Amino acid sequence: LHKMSMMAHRVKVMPYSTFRLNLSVTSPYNADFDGDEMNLHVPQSEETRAELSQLCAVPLQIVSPQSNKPVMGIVQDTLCGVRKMTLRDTFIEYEQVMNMLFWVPSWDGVVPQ
């Protein structure tokens, strides 16, 4: 329906016979996991590889020109999760804090007070 339905992704080779997708890109694709089939095309030249990497890349398509607002967001369980996470009466013990901090790829290695 729109340009966000066809985007450039980075390949990660994995076992089993299903395409794996992040949960935040389902809404622009308008897809669920009840039996949807999706297509993949491989460029065969350096110029088209650069075109895909610099024009059709997924991060460049976060904000859409239709309504100058993002089309990808935190959805489904994660959304519910953060509503249960940022409550005023939620407290975390030290070991779980260390595990969660290590789970952050962009963590700077400093434990907050």
Partner 1 sequence: ELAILKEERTTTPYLTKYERARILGTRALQISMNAPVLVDIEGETDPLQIAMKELSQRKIPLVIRRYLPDGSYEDWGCDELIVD
Partner 2 sequence: KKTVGSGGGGLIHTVMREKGPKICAELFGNIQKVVNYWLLHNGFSIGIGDAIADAS
Partner 3 sequence: AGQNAIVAIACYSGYNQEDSMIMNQSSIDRGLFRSLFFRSYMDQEKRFGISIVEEFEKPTRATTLRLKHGTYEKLDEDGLIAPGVRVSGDDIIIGKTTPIPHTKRDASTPLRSTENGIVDQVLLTTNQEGLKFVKVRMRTTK
In three-state secondary structure terms, 69 is strand
Residue 7 binds which one of partner 3, partner 1, partner 2, none, with CB within 5 to 8 A depending on kind? none
| Annotated binding residue 89 | no
Determine the Cα–Cα distance for residues 77 and 5; give it in Å rounded to an integer. Answer: 23
46 near partner 1, rule: CB under 8 A: yes
Q: What are phi and psi of 54, to 5 degrees?
A: -105, -10
Distances (CA, A) of 49 to 3, 9, 44, 98: 18, 11, 7, 40
Distance in angstroms between the alpha carbons of the first and the last residue of the chain: 48
Out of 3, 5, 36, 66, name the contact with Mg ion by CB under 5 A.
Answer: 36
Contact status, residue 63 vs residue 72, Cβ threshold 8 Å = no
Q: Residue 11 CB, nearest distance to partner 2 (Å)? A: 16
Residue among 57 and 75 whose Cβ is closer to partner 1? 57
55 near partner 1, rule: CB under 8 A: yes
100 near partner 1, rule: CB under 8 A: no
Binding site for partner 2 (CB under 8 A): 22-24, 27, 57-60, 62-63, 67-74, 77-82, 84-85, 96, 99-100, 103-106
Binding residues for Mg(2+): 32, 34, 36
